[PDB]
Write a protein that binds this ligand. Structure first.
Ligand SMILES: [Mg+2]
Ligand SMILES: [Zn+2]
Ligand SMILES: [Zn+2]
Length: 1259
DNA sequence: GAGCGTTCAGCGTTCGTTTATCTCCCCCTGGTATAATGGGAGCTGTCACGGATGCA
DNA sequence: TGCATCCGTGAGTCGAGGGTAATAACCAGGGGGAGATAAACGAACGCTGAACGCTCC
């Protein structure tokens, strides 16, 4: 397995594969149910239906295999061969592949200079083509053919003379005869009028005969090849009057002749000349055409593969005529489609054999061509072959396409054995690395292991007897089962699996019932609540696989989210509420026994048990040896004339008993914490522990926090009641005052002084102010000790506006299609809405449910496309060779006489390693090649340096993937990233995981469309696809004087650049709403108006570094608007992938095509060779292209095919004949090989293990 | 030797065998002699994006 | 050269489950495999005892 070469299969190649030929539409005898002879399913060609049995019944036995029975010709072998062996159909008349024509023009290519409308006419028997002309003959014998037409021309003139003479005589005779009789007044005039009408008809006929004769002669003189000829009658006149000079034909046979006579090298030369000297769209037509035709000359394969002579047939097992229970049958649709082409081909042979006309044979050839088209791609032309009428028939390409196609349903994602499923429940008594596994569930998973142990322990005699024992479920099995599951991990998994913490290994543990017990800390990583949520269970089998589940995927080595290095295994609903009550100051209750001194922390618990002391009360408490005091307590000490070291001996401390209890959970070396804990400070110490302490201590401490948190949440006494939710007393008055304020506007609208649209905007603003005022009144009313406020202030769950609409008024509600009602909701859910208030509220509620389902769909699509472009980024080098970094602002917005750090320093500059040292006083503070952390960043801001240059993923110069140093330290582990990690897949998941969480839109459009640029997930998708924004704001090229022209038709902005350079004229919309002053200076980087900057022009003018800054900054503001935090390295990896290619312009010396994407590294190599060759280098300019476009233009056709396009990529790969080297990730999942990422690397997988000599010496 | 005692023997003597004849329905093909001479028929509304393809 | 049009592609995740319709119709001939009765050999038996030995008077 080294390369998956693909190309065009020629006619001889198809015959070579075949082990026979299908000659009938027969499938199976209706009575015996056995395959027929020389039809579909035939055993002579495909293989024997039963193992080693032939068709006639001779040679049934297994002995004489590998022979051919002389009776029926069946070769005895295994029945499985039917899945491999394939046949072929011979076609009487050639047909043309539906793929290579009838598609996009990058695959058909205009290889013959014919329009698709032209092709439709010729191959479907509606117009002729002149496949060949004897242009030399025509010149040599020209006077003879000229002599024949000239004498032929004479005859019409002689005939015209006589008919006209008779016409002249006829007019003279009838007028004269009538006038002698004189029967009426005007006999001569009426008949002469009739007579001249007859002359006109004869004269008109004379025009038809001469002009038709003229028309047939002039088509001779334009008898160039590939000339379509629409009029069938005219062709017959050409053909009958003269043969042996022009050769004409119809259909796919004509095309085959044209490709035979093609001289493709000369066509390429003339196409190159047009590219060398051409203008307008004429150059582009030659440019696209060059792409297809050049591929044919370089490749050995001939173009004749377009027109197939023999149709291969799928092996019978892949299109099964399976018996169905109940005596019915089940057949695959390929049989029906294969039946039609066999039927129509067979009839064509009959029609050709006897003498038949052209009309009848053409219709059969037309139907044969249509039948083959339906087989390869049903529905690419007209109506599909519906068969039963209820549904389109499946087709060859239909199996290779879409979400349900072979690629995306049976090669990337398969169903698996040794797997299970069940609902999940919460078990608090578990440890972090433990899960409950139901008895019955585990028994069916571990059935092979239980059977092996049952035999060894002699409870079961043999393998079949062991099988029977477990199926019955005898008592002995359960004892054996607990023995075998121990120390054997199982991989839990929830269904959406957005990010890599979706799959986590656990140590199983048997539990009765039928629901998987799970650990409450790990819920948010799975995103699992306990409404009802089935979770799949997989079992790792081999020694390598289960080793991976213990080390890599365990649930205790995954404390930190890889997105931003934030804790994920301390959720907050109950635990955080408990700890908040436990560590809070007095006055939360009656602080009994406060302001006293206690002998030891034990004695305080004694006082608490008696009830004198309370848990939340300030007290003086002593402290045993070894407990570190606060960091600010280290300089001060007790009063003594001697030096003292209070850091690890006795010390009193002003605190509360609860804080003393809480600290005992933390490890002994940890300094004391004396403040109320909340949620933010709680997350901090878990993050602090993960940095400075080993992994085992972090996992153990969380369990202590879980137990203490749950215990005190019970004792905290949070509840809900009708008297707990207290409505603001002031509220009623506040609402009435606004109503009176409102009503004057209503009054002054009745008199017509204000338009309704202006009134709606002014009322919404008035109501919005009202909601804030009643919120403030309510916030003041509530006491800090009540339940509802306590569980929001603590950060447990909920938000302020949610609490507002339970007690205070809900406020304005968004009407359908983003409008506001003028009459907001005045009642609270406690007070109970009215009927009409409830109806209007539904408009927003249902819309939110429908929209949320859509955002999941789009976020899933965004993640999938991101993964393709972001793969092939693997850490494959310890350290890069280079010095180029990126300059980031550590500190900004510094008020006068003080230094203020940057607001987003964590996501931006943390966990990066300095490209070069930093000197401010002439001395290095932070040396180079040191990753930045809390301590180092503090050093730099204290000394006052305002920027830093950190090495980063963009400027990495690694020939394969990215080095470890440029990526900097990872975030899920807090150490330098390991070699072989797949940073690419990690980055894609991190961007896509909070996509569902975004859900942001303009609150109200205001009645204007286009003023507000795309927000949220559409904006993210727009940024990553390189799409020009909906609201586009132009960019200044350089300095100069700018001014505005307010033309009536449309607005306009014209800027006169300084230094005499060429004028530049910018257009704008009529509602431009610009902001720059008139006749004033402009700079290079500013944007002229409000909107969203176009990423392409920022690349064009500013530079590659600037567009990197722009893209990372733009997408981050979407995320930071909500509250999610993604470290900039994750963004940077994807943006690195977009800038990789380069667009070549003026491709004279590089010798490849102009104006197509080419990767940067190949461009550099080709230029280096050409200057070595003496030729001047070809230029290139950087080009940014979307994640979709970047993914498709990859070297590996197999990975590209497994992406969105599965026809175009297959079609052009066949033309280009691209051998797929199998290096990569997606394509190594298709074949079943080991992915080059992590343990699959050459370096990690090839190691060897031997003991030491001292180990052998002992035993 | 008497009288009967075991056991090859080759030889008949038809019965053993498999192997040769010979009589029968599904299955395929061909043929009807007034005159008869261009389909029914099922649709249709997502959404954005882009690039080919037509045409003023 | 620009503007107008249509065509192709993609659009989440795991759960639950099995059947679809309609019009000249016949002798007439005749082939071709699928099931029904006498001839070639050798093996059970068959009396043929005959031809050998095994004990007994
Ligand atoms: Mg749920
Ligand atoms: Zn056979
Ligand atoms: Zn590097």
């Amino acid at each position: 397995f080294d390369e998956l070469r693909i190309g065009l299969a020629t006619a001889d190649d198809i015959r070579q594969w075949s082990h026979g030929e299908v000659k009938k539409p027969e499938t199976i005898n209706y009575r015996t149910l056995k395959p027929e002879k020389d039809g579909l399913f035939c055993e002579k060609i495909f293989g024997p239906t039963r193992d080693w049995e032939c068709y006639c019944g001779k040679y049934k036995r297994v002995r004489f295999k590998g022979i051919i029975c002389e009776r029926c010709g069946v070769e005895v072998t295994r029945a499985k061969v039917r899945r491999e062996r394939m046949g072929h159909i011979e076609l009487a008349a050639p047909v043309t592949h539906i793929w290579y024509f009838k598609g996009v023009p990058s695959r058909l290519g205009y290889l013959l200079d014919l329009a698709p409308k032209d092709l439709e006419k010729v191959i479907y028997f509606a117009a002729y083509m002149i496949t060949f002309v004897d242009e030399e003959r025509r010149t040599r014998d020209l006077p003879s053919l000229e002599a024949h037409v000239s004498v032929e021309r004479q005859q019409i003139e002689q005939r015209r003379d006589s008919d006209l003479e008779a016409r002249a005589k006829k007019l003279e005779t009838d007028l004269a005869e009538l006038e002698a009789e004189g029967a009426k007044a005007d006999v001569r005039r009426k008949v002469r009028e009739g007579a001249e009408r007859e002359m006109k008809q004869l004269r008109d006929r004379a025009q038809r005969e001469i002009d038709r004769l003229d028309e047939v002669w002039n088509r001779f003189k334009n008898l160039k090849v590939q000339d379509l000829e629409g009029d069938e009658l005219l062709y017959r006149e050409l053909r009958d009057r003269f043969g042996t000079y022009f050769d004409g034909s119809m259909g796919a046979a004509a095309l085959q002749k044209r490709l035979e006579s093609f001289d493709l090298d000369e066509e390429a030369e003339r196409l190159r000349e047009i590219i060398r000297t051409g203008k307008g769209q004429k150059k582009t037509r030659a440019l696209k055409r060059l792409k297809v035709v050049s591929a044919f000359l370089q490749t050995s394969n001939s173009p004749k593969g377009m027109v197939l002579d023999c149709v291969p047939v799928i092996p019978p097992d892949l299109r099964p005529m399976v018996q169905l229970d109940g005596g019915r049958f089940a057949t695959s649709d390929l049989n029906d489609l294969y039946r039609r082409v066999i039927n129509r081909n067979n009839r064509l042979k009959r029609l050709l054999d006897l003498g038949a006309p052209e009309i009848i044979v053409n219709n059969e050839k037309r139907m044969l061509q249509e039948a083959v088209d339906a087989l390869f791609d049903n529905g690419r032309r007209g109506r599909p072959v519906t068969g039963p009428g209820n549904r389109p028939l499946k087709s060859l390409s239909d199996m290779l396409k879409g979400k349900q196609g072979r690629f995306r349903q049976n090669l990337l994602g398969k169903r698996v054995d040794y797997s299970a499923r069940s609902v999940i429940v919460v078990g608090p008594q578990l440890k972090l690395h433990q899960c409950g596994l139901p008895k019955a569930m585990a028994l069916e998973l571990f059935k092979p292991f239980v059977m092996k142990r049952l035999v060894d322990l002699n409870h079961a005699q043999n393998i079949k007897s062991a099988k029977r024992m477990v199926e019955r479920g005898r008592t002995v099995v359960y004892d054996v089962l607990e023995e075998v599951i121990a120390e054997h991990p199982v991989l839990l998994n929830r269904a959406p699996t957005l990010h890599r913490l979706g799959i986590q290994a656990f140590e199983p543990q048997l539990v009765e019932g039928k629901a998987i017990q799970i650990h409450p800390l790990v819920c948010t990583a799975f995103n699992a609540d306990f409404d009802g949520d089935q979770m799949a269970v997989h079992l790792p089998l081999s020694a390598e696989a289960q080793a991976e589940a213990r080390i890599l995927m365990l649930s205790s080595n995954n404390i930190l989210k890889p997105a931003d290095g934030r804790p994920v295994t301390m959720p907050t609903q109950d635990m955080v509420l408990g700890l908040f009550f436990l560590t809070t100051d007095s006055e939360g209750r009656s602080p009994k026994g406060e302001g006293r001194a206690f002998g030891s922390s034990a004695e305080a618990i004694m006082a608490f048990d008696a009830g004198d002391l309370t848990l939340q009360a300030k007290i003086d408490i002593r402290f045993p040896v070894g407990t570190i005091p606060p960091r600010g307590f280290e300089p001060p000490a007790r009063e003594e004339g001697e030096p003292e070291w209070q850091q690890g001996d006795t010390f009193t401390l002003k605190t509360t008993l609860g804080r003393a209890l809480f600290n005992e959970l933390l490890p002994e070396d940890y300094p004391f914490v004396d403040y109320e804990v909340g949620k933010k400070q709680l997350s901090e110490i878990v993050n602090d522990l993960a940095e400075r302490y080993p992994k085992v201590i972090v996992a153990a401490t969380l369990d202590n926090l879980k137990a203490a948190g749950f215990f005190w949440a019970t004792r905290s006494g949070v509840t809900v009641a009708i008297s707990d939710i207290v409505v603001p007393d002031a509220k009623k008055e506040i609402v009435k005052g606004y109503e009176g304020q409102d009503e004057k506007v209503q009054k002054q609208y009745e008199r017509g002084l204000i338009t309704k649209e202006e009134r709606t905007q002014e009322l919404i603003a008035i109501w919005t102010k009202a909601t804030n005022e009643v919120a403030e009144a309510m916030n003041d009313n509530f006491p800090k000790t009540n339940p509802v406020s306590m569980m929001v202030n603590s950060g447990a769950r909920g938000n302020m506006m949610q609490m507002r609409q339970i007690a205070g008024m809900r406020g304005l509600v968004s009407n359908a299609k983003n409008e506001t009602i003028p009459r907001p909701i005045k009642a609270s859910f406690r007070e109970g809405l009215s009927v009409l208030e409830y109806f209007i509220s539904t408009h927003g509620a249902r819309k939110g449910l429908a929209d949320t389902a859509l955002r999941t769909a789009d976020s899933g699509y965004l993640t999938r496309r991101l993964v393709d472009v972001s793969q092939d980024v693997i850490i494959r080098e310890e350290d890069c060779g280079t010095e180029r970094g990126l300059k980031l602002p550590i500190a900004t917005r510094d008020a006068d006489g003080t230094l203020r750090k940057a607001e987003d320093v964590e996501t931006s500059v943390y966990a990066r390693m300095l490209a070069e040292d930093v000197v401010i006083d002439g001395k290095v503070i932070a040396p180079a090649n040191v990753d930045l952390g809390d301590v180092l960043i503090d050093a730099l801001v204290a000394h006052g340096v305002e920027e830093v240059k950190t090495r980063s993923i963009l400027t990495c110069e690694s020939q394969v993937g990215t080095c470890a140093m440029c990526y900097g330290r990872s975030l899920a582990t807090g150490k330098l990233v390991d070699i072989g990690e797949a940073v690419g897949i990690i980055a894609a998941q991190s961007i896509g995981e909070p996509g569902t969480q975004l859900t942001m839109r303009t609150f109200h459009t205001g009645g204007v469309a286009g003023d507000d640029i795309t927000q949220g997930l559409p904006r993210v998708v727009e940024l990553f696809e390189a799409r020009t924004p909906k609201g586009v704001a132009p960019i200044s090229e350089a300095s100069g004087r700018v001014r505005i022209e307010e033309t009536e038709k449309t607005k306009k902005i014209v800027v006169t650049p300084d230094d005499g350079s060429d004028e530049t004229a910018f257009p704008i919309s009529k509602r431009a709403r610009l902001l720059v002053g008139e006749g004033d200076h402009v700079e290079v980087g500013q944007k002229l108006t409000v909107g969203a900057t176009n990423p392409h022009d920022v690349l064009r003018i500013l530079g590659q570094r600037a567009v990197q800054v722009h893209l990372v900054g733009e997408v981050q503001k979407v995320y930071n608007s909500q509250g999610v935090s993604i470290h900039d390295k994750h963004i940077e990896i994807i943006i690195r992938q977009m800038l990789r290619r380069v667009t070549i312009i003026e491709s004279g010396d590089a010798e490849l095509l102009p104006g197509e994407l080419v990767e940067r590294t190949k461009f550099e190599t080709e230029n280096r060779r050409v200057v070595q060759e003496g030729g001047h280098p070809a230029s290139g300019r950087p080009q940014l292209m979307g994640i979709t476009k970047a993914s498709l233009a990859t070297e590996s056709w197999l990975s590209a095919a497994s992406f969105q396009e599965t026809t175009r990529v297959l079609t052009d790969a066949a033309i280009n004949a691209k051998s797929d080297s199998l290096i990569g990730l997606k394509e190594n999942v298709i074949i079943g090989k080991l992915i080059p990422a992590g343990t699959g690397l050459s370096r990690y997988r090839n190691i060897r293990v031997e003991p030491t000599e001292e180990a052998k010496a002992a035993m």
